[PDB]
Each structure stands twice: as C-alpha cells, then as structure tokens.
C-alpha cells in the first residue's frame, strides 16, 4: 500500500525466524530501537504488528523516531519511545515497471503534523491560500496526494524502497510469537541459567502459591526484580529467588 495509507498487519502464533530472510533479499537498512539485533533471537514478543509501505531512496532516513520530513510530518510518524525494528531494502526490480509506475502515492500537503501511528486517507482539497476553493483545483489550492512515478532509469535516491516496520512490546503480556531457540527441560530447586519467555537470569526457582490474572505473565512484588514467572509450557507459577542467599 502507499505511504499515505499504510497497511498494518498483526503477526501472532508463529515463529519469528528471520534466518530465512537472508536468501530472499538483502536489507539496505535494518536498525532496531529499544532492542538489539544480536539479542533478537533470545527474546519473546507480546504483540507484533507489521506496518508496510513503499518510499524512495532519499526518504528511508525519515522513518525513525525523532526525525523530521514530509513523510514524518504528513504520512507516517514513529513514537519517541518506539520499541521495534525498521526493515528496508531496494525494490527497483519489481515495483518499478517500464514507462513509470504511478500506483504509489505520498501526501505532499497537510494542515499540520501527525501524532505517531496515525494514518490520514482523506482526499479533500488543501486550502493553501486564504480563499476557499470549495472542491475545485486551481491556484492557492492543491490536491494533497502526489504520485511517486518510479522509473527504472531513475537514480538511487528515486528508486523504490519497500519498508516493513515491526512494532512490538517486550515482556508485558503473554508471548505468542518468538524466535528459533529450542526449548529444553526445566530443572526446579537448582541454580541454573534460565530463559523464561525471553527473560534471562541466574537463580534458583521454587514452586509458588501465587495466582496470576490471564493478562499477567510476569510479577514484581518490589518492582526491581521479577519475583515469579509463569512457565510457557506448563501453566504452573514458579517464583524465582536469587541463587546465592542467606548472608554468610
């Protein structure tokens, strides 16, 4: 879809393995916010949404938190506290047909900037001048949408760039989708390196009598350490204590 009306798709109940994605294409831009790309495997994600659009080569930099531009103001804005990864690659092969392709649009004029994760599909005439045009195009009023016009002979700055933006939250809810690491056995009442739904640490876990709400997976009594976790395979609740304790 065009950048003025970006498509948002919910990804859930699968395995977020990007190891298959090297052979499909090479991403020109792959930079993550609030999460590291190297640590993208050993984590589990609560809610994942994919935002997809098509922009140019001189426009990929505007898809970032705390960045200005005509797309950042009028087409697609990212929040300041954004936790996600932006995936972008050149697509001059498929999207850019011969004679130009004019199926991708961008909103050139708007009254003001956009709040983050907000789309505007209204096609009403922008009243640039003081006089109201009232539904006709002419002087001092323009159609807000403009055509990209991708042509294979353009430079890299005008080549098509397919962008998929993944928005996800870390460790606040049950995790439906995460990576390729294989689950192992559970060793209770022992000091062991544990990884529960992407939460890694060192300690000894015991059985707990706590009760968890269905929207709660991670608990804190004192908000500096996670007291208890719900195991992803078996629904029993196991409270985690530090490995070395007693104060000798």
């Amino acid at each position, epitope marked *: 879809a065009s950048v003025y009306a970006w498509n948002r798709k919910r990804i859930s109940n699968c395995v977020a393995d990007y190891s298959v994605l090297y052979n499909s294409a090479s991403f020109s831009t792959f930079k993550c916010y609030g999460v590291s790309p190297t640590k993208l495997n050993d984590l589990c994600f609560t809610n994942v949404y994919a935002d997809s659009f098509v922009i140019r080569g001189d426009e990929v930099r505007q898809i970032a938190p705390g960045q200005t531009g005509k797309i950042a103001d009028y087409n697609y804005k990212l929040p300041d506290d954004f936790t996600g990864c932006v995936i972008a690659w050149n697509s001059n092969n498929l999207d850019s*047909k*011969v*004679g*130009g*392709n*004019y*199926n991708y*649009l961008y909103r050139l004029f708007r009254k003001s900037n956009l709040k983050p994760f907000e789309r505007d599909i209204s*096609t009403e005439i922008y009243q640039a001048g003081s006089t109201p045009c009232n539904g006709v*195009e*002419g*002087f001092n009023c323009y*159609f807000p*949408l*403009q*055509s990209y*016009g991708f*042509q294979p*002979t353009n430079g890299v700055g005008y080549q098509p760039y397919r962008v998929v933006v993944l928005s996800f939250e870390l460790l606040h809810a049950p995790a439906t989708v995460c990576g390729p690491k294989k689950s192992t056995n559970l060793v209770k009442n022992k000091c062991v390196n544990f990884n529960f739904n992407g939460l890694t640490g060192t300690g000894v876990l015991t059985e707990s009598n706590k009760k968890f709400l269905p929207f709660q997976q991670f608990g804190r009594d004192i908000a500096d350490t996670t007291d208890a976790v719900r195991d992803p395979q078996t629904l029993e609740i196991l409270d985690i204590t530090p490995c070395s304790f007693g104060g000798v």
Partner: antibody, heavy 129, light 108 residues
Framework: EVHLVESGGGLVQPGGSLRLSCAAS????????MDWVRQAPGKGLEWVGR??????????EYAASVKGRFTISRDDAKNSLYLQMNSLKTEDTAVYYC?????????????????????WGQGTLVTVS | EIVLTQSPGTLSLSPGERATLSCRAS???????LAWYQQKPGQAPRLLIY???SRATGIPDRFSGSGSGTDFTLTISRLEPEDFAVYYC?????????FGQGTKLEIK
C-alpha cells in the same frame, strides 16, 4: 505487439445514429484504461472520452462539448471497445482514434496520476453532411 | 480548462541542424505531466516523451524534451529526412486532457 483495429465508419446525415468498434489483440485489454481522441481534418487533436476497468466499474468521463450526446462502453470478453454516436452536428466530422492509456497509471478520487496515451490506432474518417 | 499554445506554428529546416519546439500552458499543469507526439501524415501519432523529460520505449536519446511550470521546450537535433511530422503537446495531470494546435515540421 499491440494492434488496435477499428470498424464502423461511414457517411451519415446530421442527427442520425452510428456505432463504432475497436478490436484489440496482443496485450491485456482488460487491464488498461482507454481513451478516445478525435482529429478534425486540418485541425488539431481533441480528446473525447476516457473509460475505466473493473477496479472502477467502467467509470466514464467525457469532454464538455460531448457530454450527453455520446456513450462509451467496452466488453473485455471478445475484446471489443464501443462508442455510441448520437445527436450529430456538423462539428462531429473528424477521424476517430481509439488510443491505449499506460497500464501503470492510477486514478484516486478524481485526479489521475500518469494516465498518458501509449499506442494509437489508424482510425476511420467519419463524415457528416 | 488548460489551454496549450504551441509556437512557432511553421518550421521548415534542412537535415542536420538544430530546431526548437515550445508548448506554453495557460496555467501551471500538475507535476510536469506533459506529453510529446509526432504524426507523419499517413499514420496516427506515437508517444515520444512522457513526463516532459523521460523517453519512451524504442525512443533514442535524440528526442529531447524539457521544461517545468508553464514553459516547456522540445528540442530535436540531427534531423533525418524521415522526421517530417506534426508535433503536439498533451496535458494529462489535470482533467480533462487537452491538446495544442500543433507545429508543422518540414524537412527540406
């Protein structure tokens, strides 16, 4: 490559009725938008009408001087393009070209982005007197 | 409606040298959506330039057009005897599309 072959021309009295057809081959005739452009003998080209595909459900737009007097239609099954001739005046004598708009043009609301003509047919000289 | 005025109306040049062609619009067309056509007398016009600067398929680098806003220029170089035609400008950014009156180019 692309072949727009036309039919239905002839000499007609003013105020009569007549039917035109353009046959097409060698390309996806369903996908492309289409135009009618007329050329009066010794005068410049003049646009007549434009038609859409299934995505806009055969939406038709006309020129100001031909609104209400002409009817354009198309059927992609037998690849036949039609225009209906009605209420003829002496200004309607011309050669009629049915031309092919680029496939990758897009039309949003009213404005059209990239809709240029790409291929043209030979046309017939219709005469009204 | 956008009125296109082509000037000058009559061109008659020998093969080899430089000739210029102009189409002037009554109002500023949207995003340089102008076309360029040639019509040899026995056959319909053919696409040359789309977007007023880009060449069509099968069209060599000889066929050169330029311009923005309201002033545009089509420039033909190295004319060959087969180049005789009438040249038209068509606007297509703003509906309805409108053609100019045309410039007649003759090869000596």
């Amino acid at each position: 490559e692309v072949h727009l072959v036309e039919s239905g021309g002839g000499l007609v009295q003013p105020g009569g009725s007549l039917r035109l057809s353009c046959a097409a081959s060698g390309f996806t005739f369903s996908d492309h938008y289409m135009d009618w452009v007329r050329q009066a003998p010794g005068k410049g080209l003049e646009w007549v009408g434009r038609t859409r595909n299934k995505a806009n459900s055969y939406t038709t737009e006309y020129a100001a001087s031909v609104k209400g007097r002409f009817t354009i239609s198309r059927d992609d099954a037998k690849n036949s393009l039609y225009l209906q001739m009605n209420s003829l005046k002496t200004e309607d004598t011309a050669v009629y070209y049915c031309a092919r708009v680029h496939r990758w043009a897009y039309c949003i609301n009213g404005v059209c982005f990239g809709a240029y003509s790409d291929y043209w047919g030979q046309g017939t000289l219709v005469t009204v007197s | 409606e956008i009125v296109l005025t082509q000037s000058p109306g009559t061109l008659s040049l020998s093969p080899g040298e430089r000739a210029t062609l102009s189409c002037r619009a009554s109002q500023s067309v949207s995003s340089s959506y102008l076309a360029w056509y040639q019509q040899k007398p026995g056959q319909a016009p053919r696409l040359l330039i789309y977007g007023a600067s880009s060449r069509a398929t099968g069209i060599p680098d000889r066929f050169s057009g330029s311009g923005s806003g309201t002033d545009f220029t089509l420039t033909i170089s190295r004319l060959e005897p087969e180049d005789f035609a009438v040249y038209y400008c068509q606007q297509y950014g703003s509906s309805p599309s409108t053609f100019g009156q045309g410039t007649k180019l003759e090869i000596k």
